Design a protein around this ligand. Structure first.
Ligand SMILES: *[C@@H]1O[C@H](CO)[C@@H](O)[C@H](O)[C@H]1NC(C)=O
Ligand SMILES: [Co+2]
Ligand SMILES: [Co+2]
Ligand SMILES: [Co+2]
Ligand SMILES: [Co+2]
Ligand SMILES: [Co+2]
Length: 432
């Protein structure tokens, strides 16, 4: 896709801190961009839509190459269309925003410049942020995570993409999403199937894979920490059902692990650690600091801070494993106890360390789940299982919760606020 200028594009500003060993943090002047899939896609020389509702223009988009030649992405009204606002080091994402049209959620990337994503090499570093999940009920996911996206959004690799990072191009993740309208500098109209349950989305013949570090997938009920390896570390196109993910006919595709090695304290049996009010260690009605440490071994550590009190990740006992560290011993015990081979099949934390030793882009999003109602995060999953089945219960939410049409009507003013991002070597982000 190219970029058009019928609607002005400015990335909302967002400050963050880079911290040094031996006690100092320095302000960085960043900004955020909305992913290209949220944007208006229209003809390069008119306002004619290339995409209407969940259907491509067969006139402008008879095939993937003609479509990209004919079509451009345009600017985004971050506050009034997409419910995205910033203040200092704080980013708020609204759930349902009513303008000319209904907008649900947003996926944003942290920028280095007007034309480049900020790249972070997680390995050896820790990432700290504050979050307010108080306004996220059952069925919603305020996510903060990293993906192995190209810094320029794909411009160098696919020079037909001249829109680039400025317009939020080049997304990939371990679901190898096929809902993207542009992949690899071409459209995704070939094999497009409009969504049965979503008037605005569809699935195309191609998807976009890469390694994914899910630091934070959470609401006021449940939180999960999950690395996902891929056999190709960075961004790569995938063909149809070879993409896997929840929207392919089978979720196990050829290159990415869609399940990950997840750590949800509730799922692991600590049902009083995280939730609303005084009865939980971490009270999700109040702001929380989440610190995630990428050990040079490839293990991942976690602690939380709430009103100045530090809490380490709670201990888990799972098979032969005892500890609070996401490491290959944990991920092997998890496959032994809860089942599956996706994570180890795709190379485990050794493969995952290839991604964290390279650049990854920071993603912040709010979404509801048109595939599985977020039950995997905050309910009993699969729904036929019981709390008698270890790992079936990931939170207290009802198995009928999280239907998009329902939660959009019930809780349109739901929101997530991410703030005070700090990044530096392990041990540094408590510095002043
Ligand atoms: C849950 O975690 C908290 C914080 O570590 C701890 O105080 C409590 O004992 C744990 N409960 C169980 C059942 O492990
Ligand atoms: Co995901
Ligand atoms: Co193909
Ligand atoms: Co099919
Ligand atoms: Co408390
Ligand atoms: Co061992």
């Amino acid at each position: 896709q190219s970029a058009c200028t019928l609607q002005s594009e400015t990335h909302p500003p967002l400050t963050w801190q880079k911290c040094s060993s031996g006690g100092t943090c320095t302000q960085q002047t960043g900004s955020v961009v909305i992913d290209a899939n949220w944007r208006w896609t229209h003809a390069t020389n008119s306002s004619t839509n290339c995409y209407d509702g969940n259907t491509w223009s067969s006139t402008l988009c008879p095939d993937n190459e003609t479509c990209a030649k004919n079509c451009c992405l345009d600017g985004a009204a971050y506050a009034s269309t997409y419910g995205v606002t910033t203040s200092g080091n704080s980013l708020s994402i609204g759930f349902v925003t009513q303008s000319a049209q209904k907008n649900v959620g947003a996926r944003l990337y942290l920028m280095a410049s007007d034309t480049t994503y900020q790249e972070f090499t997680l390995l050896g570093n820790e990432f700290s942020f504050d979050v307010d999940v108080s306004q996220l009920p059952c069925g919603l996911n305020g996510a903060l995570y990293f993906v192995s996206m190209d810094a320029d959004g794909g411009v160098s690799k696919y020079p037909t993409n001249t829109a680039g990072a400025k317009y939020g191009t080049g997304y990939c993740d371990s679901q190898c999403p096929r809902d993207l309208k542009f992949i690899n500098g071409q459209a995704n109209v070939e094999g497009w199937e409009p969504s049965s349950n979503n008037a605005n989305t569809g699935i195309g013949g191609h998807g976009s894979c890469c390694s994914e570090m899910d630091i934070w997938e959470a609401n006021s009920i449940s939180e999960a920490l999950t690395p996902h390896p891929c056999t190709t570390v960075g961004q790569e196109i995938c063909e149809g059902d070879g993409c896997g993910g929840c929207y392919s006919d089978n979720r196990y595709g050829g290159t990415c692990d869609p399940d990950g090695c997840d750590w949800n304290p509730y799922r692991l049996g600590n049902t009083s650690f995280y939730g609303p009010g005084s009865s939980f260690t971490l009270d999700t009605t109040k702001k929380l600091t989440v610190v995630t440490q990428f050990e040079t071994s490839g293990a991942i550590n976690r602690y939380y801070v709430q009103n100045g009190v530090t809490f380490q990740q709670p201990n888990a006992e799972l098979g032969s494993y005892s500890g609070n560290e996401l490491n290959d011993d944990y991920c092997t015990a998890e496959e032994a106890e809860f089942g599956g081979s996706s994570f180890s099949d795709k190379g485990g934390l050794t493969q995952f360390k290839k991604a964290t030793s390279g650049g990854m882009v920071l993603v912040m999003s709010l979404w509801d789940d048109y595939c599985a109602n977020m039950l995997w995060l905050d309910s009993t999953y699969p729904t036929n299982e019981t709390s008698s089945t270890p790992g079936a219960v990931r939170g207290s939410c009802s198995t009928s919760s999280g239907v998009p049409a329902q939660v959009e009507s019930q809780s349109p003013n739901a929101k997530v606020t991410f703030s005070n991002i700090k990044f530096g070597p392990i041990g540094s982000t408590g510095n002043p």
